[PDB]
Amino acid sequence: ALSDADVQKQIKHMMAFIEQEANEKAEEIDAKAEEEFNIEKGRLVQTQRLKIMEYY
Amino acid sequence: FVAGVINRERIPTFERMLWRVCRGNVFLRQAEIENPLEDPVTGDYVHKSVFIIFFQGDQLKNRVKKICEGFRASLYPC
Amino acid sequence: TEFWLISAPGEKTCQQTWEKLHAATTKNNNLAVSSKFNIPDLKVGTLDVLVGLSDELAKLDAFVEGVVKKVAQYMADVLEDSKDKVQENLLASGVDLVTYITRFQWDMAKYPIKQSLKNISEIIAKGVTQIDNDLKSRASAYNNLKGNLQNLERKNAGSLLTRSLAEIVKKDDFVLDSEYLVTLLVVVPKLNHNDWIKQYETLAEMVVPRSSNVLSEDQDSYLCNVTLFKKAVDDFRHKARENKFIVRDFQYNEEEMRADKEEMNRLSTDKKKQFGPLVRWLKVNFSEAFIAWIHIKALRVFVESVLRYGLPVNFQAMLLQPNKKSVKKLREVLHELYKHLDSSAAQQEYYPYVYYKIDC
């Protein structure tokens, strides 16, 4: 609003909201990435194990 | 942030009514036009002094869009 | 139970505490009731989402408010061992409104403390939707009972021209099992008792004078049975109409009389058996809906407090019971305390503090 004090405070608050969401989202993204790492790796590995089983 | 151009007749309430959409949520953009052209709707030349709220969020940007458009304001540029 | 729930900017918890707890600080010069309000710490990932939820919450607020009023009406509606002015409000989880509120806590029973805001709103909404449908079905059962009961009161009510004669006609007086003699029921004003008996004779040929005998009396008329040869009944009733007399077409029916007595007792018994458990079920629905209502208000509190202040989120709030005719002063004090903290530019347009109304 009109007062610089108020608008500056509002900006600090907004940036804080922007940062909090950004921070949470990045951690979320990395966590899911790790989950998928293990899941996908296993999926492909087991697929190959079955293929090798057939060669056997 | 996208500041509009207004006839400045109601920038008092333009700004306050936008504040209250989500108060203090985005920074106020102040823009002014000196020696303007005649307003298209009223054919009247009058300096613009506009306090604008612009939001990143889609729900709130849509909200302020509705609020600022209900008000006699021009939001032409992006 | 009208209380205001107030959100504070919370710059200093010890300071807000002083301004809210201290006798020297209690609102309206320590005459108003001021209790602190707290909720578990919760985070919302996106404020724009919070904004959407804010609108959603207000809608849910209205929904559950409707739901609880409906509930109040259904309890009021049964009137079983109760009246409009007695036990108007029920305890929530066994305590009163102020007690509940002060003891109100976010219930994991309502939502995981790790539950998403969206999901919390969803839990509340699903709950009350469930409550609404329960109310719909039980209220239907209530209205059905009330309707048939009144229908029965009407059956055993009214004048002798239309009232059931189950209590009146005896098997020994009604001419039963006669192939040729049919009994008609006539209602004669007392002042004209003897006249219609004579009139009956003049309604059809082969109508035996003086056979008309009063079985019971009404307030305006006597109800008498008349015996006549079956063939003449058409002439009997027609001429009766000509003499402004109404002849009742009535047959003795033992099975129907018993059937009606059975329905009378059946309906009264079911009424009692239903209201007992009906109201207990309703009482649970009530307690659950109130708890939810406060849950909703608290969420709105979360949303709002975040929206005004963002981070950090220690939230300070007050639950205030205004004193009579001091709400202006209460507001003025809160305005003085927070207005300069809310904004330099300067309710719904602007608000020194966020508050919501409680009225139950």
From Swiss-Prot, chain A:
Task: Spell out which residues are annotated as carrying N-acetylalanine.
Answer: 1
Give the fragment's position in the full-length protein.
Answer: 2 to 57 of 226
Family, according to the entry, reads as follows: Belongs to the V-ATPase E subunit family.
Q: What does this protein do?
A: Subunit of the V1 complex of vacuolar(H+)-ATPase (V-ATPase), a multisubunit enzyme composed of a peripheral complex (V1) that hydrolyzes ATP and a membrane integral complex (V0) that translocates protons. V-ATPase is responsible for acidifying and maintaining the pH of intracellular compartments and in some cell types, is targeted to the plasma membrane, where it is responsible for acidifying the extracellular environment.
Signal sequence coordinates = none
State which tissues express it. Answer: Expressed in brain (at protein level).
Q: Which gene encodes it?
A: Atp6v1e1
Q: How does it assemble?
A: V-ATPase is a heteromultimeric enzyme made up of two complexes: the ATP-hydrolytic V1 complex and the proton translocation V0 complex. The V1 complex consists of three catalytic AB heterodimers that form a heterohexamer, three peripheral stalks each consisting of EG heterodimers, one central rotor including subunits D and F, and the regulatory subunits C and H. The proton translocation complex V0 consists of the proton transport subunit a, a ring of proteolipid subunits c9c'', rotary subunit d, subunits e and f, and the accessory subunits ATP6AP1/Ac45 and ATP6AP2/PRR.
Q: Where in the cell is it found?
A: Apical cell membrane; Cytoplasmic vesicle, Secretory vesicle, Synaptic vesicle membrane; Cytoplasmic vesicle, Clathrin-coated vesicle membrane
The Phosphotyrosine modification is found at 55
Specify the protein name. V-type proton ATPase subunit E 1
Give the highest taxon in the source lineage: Eukaryota
Curated annotation (Swiss-Prot), chain B:
Reading the lineage from the top rank, the first entry is: Eukaryota
Q: Where in the cell is it found?
A: Cytoplasmic vesicle, Clathrin-coated vesicle membrane; Cytoplasmic vesicle, Secretory vesicle, Synaptic vesicle membrane; Melanosome
State the protein's purpose. Subunit of the V0 complex of vacuolar(H+)-ATPase (V-ATPase), a multisubunit enzyme composed of a peripheral complex (V1) that hydrolyzes ATP and a membrane integral complex (V0) that translocates protons. V-ATPase is responsible for the acidification of various organelles, such as lysosomes, endosomes, the trans-Golgi network, and secretory granules, including synaptic vesicles. In certain cell types, can be exported to the plasma membrane, where it is involved in the acidification of the extracellular environment. Required for assembly and activity of the vacuolar ATPase.
- Assembly behavior: V-ATPase is a heteromultimeric enzyme made up of two complexes: the ATP-hydrolytic V1 complex and the proton translocation V0 complex. The V1 complex consists of three catalytic AB heterodimers that form a heterohexamer, three peripheral stalks each consisting of EG heterodimers, one central rotor including subunits D and F, and the regulatory subunits C and H. The proton translocation complex V0 consists of the proton transport subunit a, a ring of proteolipid subunits c9c'', rotary subunit d, subunits e and f, and the accessory subunits ATP6AP1/Ac45 and ATP6AP2/PRR. Interacts with SPAAR.
Give the UniProt family note: Belongs to the V-ATPase 116 kDa subunit family.
**What's the protein name?**
V-type proton ATPase 116 kDa subunit a 1
Say which species the protein is native to.
Rattus norvegicus (Rat)
Species lineage, top-down? Eukaryota, Metazoa, Chordata, Craniata, Vertebrata
Swiss-Prot record, chain C:
Role played: Subunit of the V1 complex of vacuolar(H+)-ATPase (V-ATPase), a multisubunit enzyme composed of a peripheral complex (V1) that hydrolyzes ATP and a membrane integral complex (V0) that translocates protons. V-ATPase is responsible for acidifying and maintaining the pH of intracellular compartments and in some cell types, is targeted to the plasma membrane, where it is responsible for acidifying the extracellular environment. Subunit C is necessary for the assembly of the catalytic sector of the enzyme and is likely to have a specific function in its catalytic activity.
Q: In which tissues is it expressed?
A: Expressed in brain (at protein level).
This protein's major location comes to membrane
The PTM N-acetylthreonine maps to: 1
| Annotated membrane topology | Peripheral membrane protein
Quaternary context? V-ATPase is a heteromultimeric enzyme made up of two complexes: the ATP-hydrolytic V1 complex and the proton translocation V0 complex. The V1 complex consists of three catalytic AB heterodimers that form a heterohexamer, three peripheral stalks each consisting of EG heterodimers, one central rotor including subunits D and F, and the regulatory subunits C and H. The proton translocation complex V0 consists of the proton transport subunit a, a ring of proteolipid subunits c9c'', rotary subunit d, subunits e and f, and the accessory subunits ATP6AP1/Ac45 and ATP6AP2/PRR.
Q: Which GO terms describe its molecular function?
A: proton-transporting ATPase activity, rotational mechanism
**What family name appears in the similarity comment?**
Belongs to the V-ATPase C subunit family.
Any idea where this protein resides? Cytoplasmic vesicle, Secretory vesicle, Synaptic vesicle membrane; Cytoplasmic vesicle, Clathrin-coated vesicle membrane
Protein name listed in UniProt: V-type proton ATPase subunit C 1
InterPro entries assigned: ATPase_V1-cplx_csu (IPR004907), Vac_ATP_synth_c_sf (IPR036132)
Per UniProt, which keywords does this protein have? Acetylation, Cytoplasmic vesicle, Hydrogen ion transport, Ion transport, Membrane, Synapse, Transport
Family matches, as Pfam families:
V-ATPase_C
Name the gene behind this protein: Atp6v1c1
